Every structure is written in structure tokens, then in C-alpha cells.
Design a protein around this ligand. Structure first.
Ligand code: GJO
Ligand code: GJO
Ligand code: GJO
Ligand code: GJO
Ligand code: FBP
Ligand code: FBP
Ligand code: FBP
Ligand code: FBP
Lengths: 318, 318, 318, 322
């Protein structure tokens, strides 16, 4: 029996006897994602090249912002693309706070690398007039989170309390189809993913863990290496195949590079609902209390056996 | 003044007062590429999931296999998917021999990684009846070669004598728009790309070259690392951004993993026409005389300064 | 401030404090309509004609049937294609009865004429086992009705107690965009639409009315004539421009050609919700109490002044 | 064996050892038709209604004119272009000139496109017969001189119908891959149909031959079945139905439209040419449409076309009343 993201979230919502706002929100997100995919896939590029006579970052941000605002389900919107939190105008305010990265990985989108949209959804916890402060919530408080991946196909991965579900965008009918239900990550994987160009500034624990993957001391096959350079692609692979992903801290970068509110946390939430783990090396990513909406956080995520092994090496150096 | 693949190839052919076969071939290949892109982007997957009540490898092969047969421009077809060369039926025989990987990278299609269609086109040399022998020419003898990348967008990259030109698929109108003319690769890059999971197996030249990239003995910034794990993706980025790509040999894969006929030679050709290089370490990829349509080869290709640097390391250890 | 059919419908549902089934029903129908639109525009047709080597009646009807069964919102499904009402199996049953024409007008689709999907939705309030007799209801009992027209573009027209709203299918993102709110028909129009090839068989009141259009007796401008031959096209033009559409009785169809349950009633309901009218000559279309799910009715609909003019002529003869 | 428009027109050019200009022209047009089709089907309409806030917006009939004009210019194959939209024939800039003269209606029927009526693009292609600088006069040729002609139909599906001396061929647009698939080869029209098409609102102003012929279609004198009526109001749709089911389509001369309404150069001629190559007929009542020597690029003409027996039957009535 065929299932869409809309049918799926409606049935979850009416079982919880909710007000409808979260379903309104995810439909808006879904619509924005579909438009982003059309633009990423370069539909109508011919017109820009003069076919009739006479920004992807920004257009993606513009779609997520406007679609989310017009949902009447949000009050505060934090985007990688905006210096300050966007306060929804009063007559459109709903009860959710969304943090998102509209087109993650676009830094190298000139080579047609996979990119994605990342989102995490919170309840406003206070009745104060809405402010930046409403996004300064730990990942533990997440209500929903996930990502759209613009890869060889476009897929939305959606994480809630009910688990992780994968919807494939059928572009012929603009409908997100349920194709993988209540997904769970391998307890131990065989791929490791991190940018080894930074090896000279590696934290010595990172160096030892990576060297244990390439030169294991126990009969075992060395892990394979993958590193797309686009987080949504690398994390999604980690979830499908298992294994470990790392953007760790070092001495030039005490807090890693990736941003906690709209990269690290949603991915950490997907991982943990998938039975995986996500650490900074000092604590669970979902346990960090943010003080700045654009703050960075180290992230080591993926299969639990692998993340656990990394923390074993990490502690050995602390 | 807008240009398309069909227009570009017709004009080069009209200028060469040709027979029109290569243009029938490249236009048929374009049709097959667009059907692949639609299918890879999940065209109508909702029918497969029961929307009306009621293999990506195989279909892509069938689309290229049939469209080329149907061009009347080919007589021998070699595909990764087929054990032996396809001999076109006499009624449809043309003068060209085509070696292709129909959906390269698809072993990891489950995580929606970038995939691609790699192709290389030869003129039949022998006057014998057509056979597998006709595909055993050195890459030097290539008339045309290139790839279609199914990434964030679908792009066709075609290399001929005139150079390497890049065409974006506008899926809104199904047309390959010329977006980069007469492309040339950077003289020296800032990215290296190889599966370092086989580090335990690297010969000393690769180990030293890779050490040079993470710990440059000269002041400089270390290279960044990218390994998508799909050759079309990794090579295109190399082309677009510069740098070096490597699949050296290892314990499994003593002759290297990638395929000479329909993976290495097309990419080496694209690269050489772009000002780049492509070596096996011992010789240029295009000088290897094949003996078996599916034989493997080591490959180091990319920006010329980076490949020359690798070869100086190779010599030091030779 | 953009708005979608999905967003519009659940916002009407939230306000009504309803059970959700109507939204699940209409969202499922929307999916069917998007799949039909794609097939109607012949996407994937090249696969039929050999692109890779190796019925719109039936296919559209399968799409509506399964999408409606899948919604859990219907219990009795009457369609043009099926001799009997389809009873939904117990575990998928909802409270709604849907009568539809899955691909109205398709008899002449070999000529690429406009076609569409007509639907009408009644509630069942028996507590008896659902049965075909639950579809024998006057149009007055319609909960919702409308149509999807596959014209130069695809539009869904949806009518409820809150009025008529018009949604454009954006094929780039597979979304139904609200483009015309709370629409109302022109008080009087300038187009009359019917098959004049039945002139030898018209009742004299039909004959007199047509003559008034061609030789206006108040010395106004003659009406223009338009007959696409496809009910959805002809009715939609009537809704947008005003005027009158007629399929009266003739020798081959002594009580009309078009079907009361899933052709006349939905169109009649849409007309009355846009401030137009729909009569059989003797009574309001919506007032007919049917005794057979496939029974036919004469229909005259359009702008109220035009229908009243026909009725003044009809009454002069009865 | 699968055949696209590009492949079918290419192999025709190889057979005749041509310069490639006509193929570059039709490929140009095919690109324009595909862009028009995507816009007609409201491709990115949601941006117009603000899914991304405030950031073409032309009116489709204007977009289509730009699309056809630009593509044809860029084909390097045309010297004089005539459009319904521009009062004067466009002279292609010299750098871009080729041998063909093209007359087209970029989005015919678009007046009612707000009701999502079927619409279409019409074209006819001539060679330049003059030796002078290209001028408007170069498009004042009789339909007889047409090299190729046809139309795109933006109906429930998009289809390009292409007529040349080799006959009439129908190519269905596959929007999934942007390819025109040859689906009906060497089409021919039924010798006699069962549908008549014309705007009967103008009955009061009809010529008496039209009145009689139409009354014959409704009240036949020989116990034949009366014809059915269809009239989309959109020439491309009506003429295509005529090509596929047979029958007759009429926009005839009026008391108040002494020269009909449809434009000779880029509406009647291409439809007349498509009919003639498909085994049918196309008359003004007083001559074959294609024989009319035009003196104005925007002059109009009566046009009766369709099944040969039906047009003939009509002319008998026309000769009786003359
Ligand atoms: C765990 O996953 C979640 C996803 C979404 C949401 S929610 O906040 O967005 N709620 C909805 O979506 C939603 C609720 C609802 C109801 C419904 C039924 C009984 C009680 C109430 N509620 C009161 C009396 O207060 C409502 C009926 C029909 C539809 N329907 O089919 O549209 C509904 N949809 C929450 C959780
Ligand atoms: C470097 O790039 C290439 C790509 C393709 C090819 S080729 O082998 O496929 N030939 C073609 O493409 C091609 C040729 C050609 C001609 C043409 C003109 C004068 C002489 C001849 N020939 C004889 C007298 O024998 C032909 C006219 C119109 C078109 N046209 O616009 O369709 C043409 N297309 C070669 C090289
Ligand atoms: C006139 O137009 C219509 C269109 C649709 C419908 S309905 O019957 O299918 N209802 C729905 O769709 C729908 C209801 C609903 C609720 C909701 C809220 C308070 C009470 C209840 N109900 C109980 C306690 O019993 C439900 C909350 C959120 C969403 N939401 O935004 O998903 C909802 N959607 C009716 C009429
Ligand atoms: C009946 O319908 C028509 C449709 C199209 C045309 S044409 O004028 O546009 N010619 C073409 O299209 C076209 C020609 C051509 C040739 C070719 C071959 C031998 C000689 C010459 N010519 C010289 C020596 O002068 C050319 C080779 C390859 C391709 N090819 O497959 O690319 C070609 N395409 C005319 C009529
Ligand atoms: O180049 P690096 O330092 O390896 O970083 C790659 C990381 O940066 C990101 O591209 C974030 O950068 P963007 O601003 O382009 O979104 C992540 O997707 C990815 O994980
Ligand atoms: O898994 P590895 O050892 O890194 O090898 C990856 C290589 O294998 C390939 O995927 C071969 O392609 P396939 O997926 O078609 O087998 C190349 O694209 C890629 O460069
Ligand atoms: O050809 P006629 O007798 O004028 O009737 C046309 C009517 O028939 C219909 O096409 C219904 O028939 P089909 O659905 O079988 O094609 C209506 O859409 C249209 O109004
Ligand atoms: O409404 P009328 O007078 O019957 O004329 C309709 C005719 O006019 C046209 O619409 C002319 O097209 P335009 O919409 O571009 O004016 C033809 O397509 C059609 O045959």
C-alpha cells in the first residue's frame, strides 16, 4: 500500500490529536524541497543562456523561508544564510522554531557534487515575544529533523519519535514516496569518512583512530574511505551503509567547522533515532547547550560500535 | 548566442564534410543519456510502489545498447554490463566502435551517490568482419570520448580534437545547453582524491606522494581531500576544480581496479584534451595497447603539474 | 502569499474540526490526477516505441481506484469504466462515496483533444454495509465535487460549501497552486456550446434558443459558438468566460448522453457554487433522484442569465 | 526502430546531400516548441505566485514569439522571418543569414488560453527566390512554393506535425526526455469524414453557400447520418482533429468579414500544405489556398479544408450559388 510523506505525517498527527501545525510545516518544507530540486537540477537553465533573447544558495533560502512563513506554523527561523534569526511577522506566527541549512555543500556545487537541505524543528518553549533565544535549545528538544538529499535522485529523510523514514521524490508527479520504513543503521560499519587533507593538524586521537582503520591490528580488513565533501551526501551514505563520519575538532579549530544548530544536531538526531550515535568527543551532540545560533560543534557520528571505538581512542588522549 | 550539443556536433561535422555518422551516434547517445537521467532521478518510481495497484544497471545498458545500434553509426559495442562485445547486426552496421560504462558508480546507487555514463568512440581500424578485436585499440586512437554525470544536475562532457566542451541538461525542455567552451584544467590543483582505505597496500611512490600532500615539505598549504567513490564524480571535479585523482593498484586489484577501455581511456582522453595528464605510472594511459576488453589499469590523472610531481616521485622509486 | 490545494484543504478541515478523511481523500485524488496528467502528456512514451529495445482509459481509472481505496476515506466507488459500484474492502473503508469519470472525453483523445477527471463526493450515513445504493443520492447531497482538466495546462477545480477554487498544476514541482479564489461565473456570457449536428432531433425549445443566439431578438450581438466536444473543456471555458453549455435530448439519447452521477452532478455543483445554474429542463440537475448509477440526464448549465433565458424558452413549450 | 524528428530530418538531408540549413532550422524550431510547451503547461508557475517571495512574466503569446524568433535567428538558416506578432517582416542580421524564409504564428488560439483551450504554433518554410538584399517581398510567395510546413499542438499531449514533399509525419513530444518521437508515418486523411467544424455563431452573416452546405450536414437529403459538429475555436486543434479523424474545417468569407479571418501566410498556407501532402484539400472557394499570390504579409483568406470528398461537396454548393 503506497505511502507519501503527507499521508505518513497526517496519520501520525491525527493519532497524536495535534493542532495540524507540524503537518502544515512539513508540507511547506516538502514543497520548498521540490522547488529546490527543480532548480538544482537546472530546469530552465536554457533561458539564462539566451534561448528566448535575454544564487542557488539564495534561491533555496528564499524558498524555505517563504514556504515556512506561509505555513502559519513557525515563529523563529534560523538559516545558515542569515546573520540573525528571522522573526516571523505576527499574523503568520505558529508554534515551531526551525533551524535549517538550505543548500548544504553548495561550496563545491560547481562540480555538481551532491547537495542537500538540512532541517531541525523545535517547539518554542517560552511565551516571550519570539527572539533568537528560542533557537538556543539542545538537540534533545528536537521534535522533528532530517534532510533532503539532491543526489542521483532527491530523497527526504525524516526523523521523528516514531523513527526514521525515507521518502523518494518522484519528479513525474511531485510526490515523496515512502521507500524505507523505520530505518536502522548497522551496528558496525566498514567505511570511514573525513577530510584527511587536514591530517597535519589532526588531533592525535583522530590520527590514531584513522590509522587503526587503515592498518588494523586484528586480522580484519581495513575500512574503505569515502568523503564526498558534502555533509548530506556523506551522512546519508553512513546511514545506508553504516560506518563513521567525522568533522572533528583540532587545535586550529577547537569546535570543528560544522554548525550545531542546522547541521550537526539534525544529523545527530537522525543517527540516534536510527540507533546510531553522534558525539563531539566530549559529549553527545544533542546534549550541547547552544549560546550562539551559528556556533560550531565537532561531530563524530554513524554506527554505534564505530563511534564507541572512536571515543575509546579519544579518551586515551584526554 | 545559445548553443546545444546537437548544434555543436553538426557544425563541427559540416565543417569536416563528413558522412554524418558520428553525429547520428552522439545524438543517439544524447537520447539515451536523457532517458537514463530521468530513470536515475526516479522518473516514475511511484508506479513501482503500487500507485495504480500494480535494474537501473540493466536499463541504462539497454538504452545505450539500443540507441547506438539504432544510430546506424556503430558496428561493435563494448559495455561493462556485457561479458563479450556486442556485434551490431549487418543491416545496421556503421563505422564506429563504442566502449562504454552505462551507469558507472552504480554499485553504491543505494546511498544516492553521483553516477555517470562513460563512453569512448573509435573508428573501426581493421577491415575484418567486426569482432571484439576492433575494440582493442589504444586510447590514442579515440575519435571522441566523454561522460554524462548524473549529479546535482545532469551534465554531458564531450571531448574531441576541438577540445572539451560541457553541456548542461535542461530537463525542463530536454536539451543539452553549452555552458563551458573549450575547457582547460588548472595547471596545478589543491585537491587529491583516492581511496586511502588501501593505504596498507600502496607502493612506496603513492605513499610518498600522498605524504607530500598532507605534509608539504615546502611551506605550503596541504591539499584538501575528496573521494566520492564514483569515478565520473571524482574525475569531473578534478576537471572543474583541478588537482589529482588516483586509483593505484593494491593487493586485490594487482592491475588496478578501473577499466582501461571504458573508464580510464575516456577519462584520460578528456583530460589530455583539457591540458591534463593521465598515467599508469609506467606509461600514459592512452598508449596502453589492450588485449582484453575488460582488463583493468592503474590510473593517475589530473592537473599536469600534479601528475608530473607524482611521476618524479615514481622515478625516485623506480 | 502562495497557497496549495493540500494546504487549503486541511486548513478548511482544521476549522471544521473534522476527522481527516476528506483531506486524505482529496490528497489521494490529487496524486492520481498528477499521475494521470503525466501519462496524458505522454511522458515515457518513447519506451513504448523502442527507446530501450524491449489504455489511458484503464490506466486513469486504475489510478483513481487505487488512490481512493488507499486513502481509507471511501467505501463506495462508482466509475464510468465499471459496470457496478466498487465496494471498498472492510479494512480500508471510510465514510465517503465517490463517483468519478477518470478520463472524460478520451474517446477522441487520438486527436489530442482536451480531457479531464470529474469527481463528486457524497457522505454515507447509513450504518448498513456499504452498497451501490449508497451512490443513489441527489446532487444536493454533495460534500465536494470538481474536476481536473488536462488542457494546455493541468488545472484542478474544487467546489465545496466555501465556494469554487482553482489550482494550477505546476509540473516542475508537482504542486497544485491556488491561482483563482472563490470564483464566480459571469452573470451573462457570449458563448453557446453544444453539438449542433443533432439539430434534426432537438426539441423545439432547444431549437428556438439556438436561434435566439444566432439572430438575437433584442438586437444584441450574436453569441459565438465553441464546442470542444469534451465536457470538462467545455464546462471550464463556461466557468472562466461565461455563457452556456448544453447536451439536451436527441434520438440516440432520449434522456441525454452525459451521466448524471459523475458527469452532470459534479459540473452542476461547481456551477451553482460559482453562482451559475444547471437544469435538465424540468428540474435542477442536483434535484434529480437517480435510480441507476449509470443513468443519463439532459444538462444545460452556465451563467444564470443564459440558463434562465433557455428556461424561459423551455417553459414557453411546456 | 525508434525515430526522432531530428533523426528523420537528418537522414532526409543526407539522401539529398544538402547544406544542413533546413535541419538546423527544424532543430531550432524543435527547441522553441519544447520551451513553449513547458511554458504553456505552466512549468514554473508557482514562482509567479510567490513560493520564493519577490524574485518570464511575459504573456506566453509574447514568450513564444521571442522563443521562435530567437531560435530561428540562431539557426543561421533564415534571412526573412514573418510573425503574426510583428507588423513588418524581420530581416535577419547579416552575420546570421541563411537561405530560408519562415512565416509562423507563435501561439495561435492564445486569445482564449485563459480557459486552457488547446493552442499551437504554426509554421511554413520557403526558400528565397530573389537575388536582392533580403526584404519583406521574399515572404510574398504562394503556398505552392512551400518547402516544409506544419505545426505544434499543445493539446493533452504536445505533437509536432511536419509536412514535406515526402509527406506528413507526426512526432509526439516525450516531456520526460525532451524528444519528438515519430509515432505516425506518412499520414493520410480519410477520403470522407463525419465531422464539420466552423463558428456557427456567425450564421446571420454566412454566405448562402455555407448556409446550404451546413444545412446538408445537419439535414442530409439521402438518408445518411447527420455529421457531428466540433469547433474548439483553436485552428491548430481543429485542423489536427480534421487530419486525424477526417471531415471539414471552415473559416469562410462573411458578409462582415469579406476575406475570412485567418491569416494566409502563417495560418492558412501551412494548414493547406499539410492537408495537400496528407491527401486532402484546402480551398478559398474560388481557388486553391496555396495558389493565392499574396500582396500583404498579413492579408487574410477564406479557408475550407479537410477530407477531399467533403471539400468537393462544398465546392459544388459554392459553384451552384455563383
Ligand atoms: C507524531 O507526529 C505528528 C505529526 C503531526 C502532528 S500535528 O500537530 O501537525 N496534528 C496533525 O497533523 C493532525 C491532527 C488531525 C486530526 C485530529 C484528530 C483528533 C484530535 C485532534 N486534535 C485536537 C482535538 O486538538 C486532531 C484529524 C485529522 C487530521 N488530518 O488527517 O489532517 C489531523 N492532522 C502531531 C504529531
Ligand atoms: C569534428 O566533428 C565532427 C562531427 C561529426 C562528423 S560526421 O562524420 O557525423 N559528418 C557530419 O556531422 C555532417 C556533415 C554535414 C554536411 C556536409 C557538407 C559537405 C560535405 C559533406 N560530406 C560529403 C560530400 O561526403 C557533408 C552538411 C550538413 C550537415 N548537417 O548539419 O547535418 C552535416 N553533418 C565529422 C566531424
Ligand atoms: C470544509 O472542508 C473540509 C475539509 C476537510 C475536512 S476533514 O473531516 O477531512 N478534517 C480535516 O481534514 C482536518 C481536521 C484537522 C484537525 C482537527 C482539529 C480539531 C478537531 C478535529 N476533529 C475531532 C476532535 O474530531 C480535527 C487538526 C489539524 C488538521 N490538519 O491541519 O491536518 C486537521 N485536518 C472537513 C471539511
Ligand atoms: C528533404 O528534406 C531535407 C532535409 C534537410 C536538408 S539539408 O539542406 O538541411 N541537409 C542536411 O540536413 C544534411 C546533409 C548531410 C550530409 C551531406 C552528405 C553529402 C553531401 C552533402 N552536401 C554537399 C557536398 O554539399 C551533405 C551528411 C551528413 C548529414 N548529417 O546526418 O548531419 C547531413 N545533413 C535538405 C532536405
Ligand atoms: O572542505 P571541508 O573542510 O572538508 O568541509 C566539508 C564540509 O563543509 C560543508 O560543505 C559545509 O559548507 P557549505 O557552506 O558549502 O554548506 C559540509 O557539507 C561538509 O561536510
Ligand atoms: O570502492 P573503491 O575501491 O573505492 O572503488 C570505487 C570505484 O569503483 C567504481 O564504482 C566502479 O564502478 P561500479 O560502481 O560500476 O562498479 C568507480 O566509479 C570508482 O572509482
Ligand atoms: O460527441 P458528442 O455526441 O457531441 O458528445 C460529446 C460528449 O461525450 C463525452 O466525450 C463523453 O464521452 P467519452 O468520455 O466516452 O469520450 C463528453 O465529454 C462530451 O461532452
Ligand atoms: O472566435 P472565432 O471568430 O470563431 O475565431 C477563432 C479563430 O481565431 C483564431 O483564434 C486566431 O487566433 P488568435 O487567438 O491568435 O487570435 C484561430 O485559432 C481560430 O480558428
Amino acid at each position: 500500500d503506497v505511502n507519501t510523506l503527507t499521508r505518513f505525517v497526517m496519520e501520525e498527527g491525527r493519532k497524536a490529536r495535534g493542532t495540524g501545525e507540524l503537518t502544515q510545516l512539513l508540507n511547506s518544507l516538502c514543497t520548498a524541497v521540490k522547488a529546490i530540486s527543480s532548480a538544482v537540477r537546472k530546469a530552465g537553465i536554457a533561458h539564462l543562456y539566451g534561448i528566448a533573447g535575454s544564487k542557488l544558495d539564495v534561491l533555496s533560502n528564499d524558498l524555505v523561508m517563504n514556504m515556512l512563513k506561509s505555513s502559519f506554523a513557525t515563529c523563529v527561523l534560523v538559516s545558515e544564510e542569515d546573520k540573525h534569526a528571522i522573526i516571523v511577522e505576527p499574523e503568520k506566527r505558529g508554534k515551531y522554531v526551525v533551524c535549517f541549512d538550505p543548500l548544504d555543500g553548495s561550496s563545491n556545487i560547481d562540480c555538481l557534487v551532491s547537495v542537500g537541505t538540512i532541517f531541525g524543528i523545535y517547539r518554542k518553549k517560552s511565551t516571550d515575544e519570539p527572539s533568537e533565544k528560542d533557537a538556543l535549545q539542545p538537540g534533545r528538544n528536537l521534535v522533528a529533523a532530517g534532510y533532503a538529499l539532491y543526489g542521483s535522485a532527491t530523497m527526504l529523510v525524516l526523523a521523528m519519535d516514531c523513527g526514521v523514514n525515507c521518502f523518494m521524490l518522484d519528479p513525474a508527479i511531485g510526490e515523496f514516496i515512502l521507500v524505507d520504513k523505520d530505518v536502522k543503521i548497522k551496528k558496525k560499519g566498514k567505511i570511514y569518512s573525513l577530510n584527511e587533507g587536514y591530517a597535519r593538524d589532526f588531533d592525535p586521537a583522530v590520527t590514531e583512530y584513522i590509522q587503526r582503520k587503515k592498518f588494523p591490528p586484528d586480522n580484519s580488513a581495513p575500512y574503505g574511505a569515502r568523503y564526498v565533501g558534502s555533509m548530506v551526501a556523506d551522512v546519508h551514505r553512513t546511514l545506508v551503509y553504516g560506518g563513521i563520519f567525522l568533522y572533528p575538532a583540532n587545535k586550529k579549530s577547537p569546535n570543528g567547522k560544522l554548525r550545531l544548530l542546522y547541521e550537526c544536531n539534525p544529523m545527530a538526531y537522525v543517527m540516534e533515532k536510527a540507533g546510531g550515535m553522534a558525539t563531539t568527543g566530549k559529549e553527545a551532540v544533542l546534549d550541547v547547550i547552544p549560546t550562539d545560533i551559528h556556533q560550531r560543534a565537532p561531530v563524530i557520528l554513524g554506527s554505534p560500535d564505530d563511534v564507541l571505538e572512536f571515543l575509546k581512542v579519544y579518551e586515551k588522549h584526554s
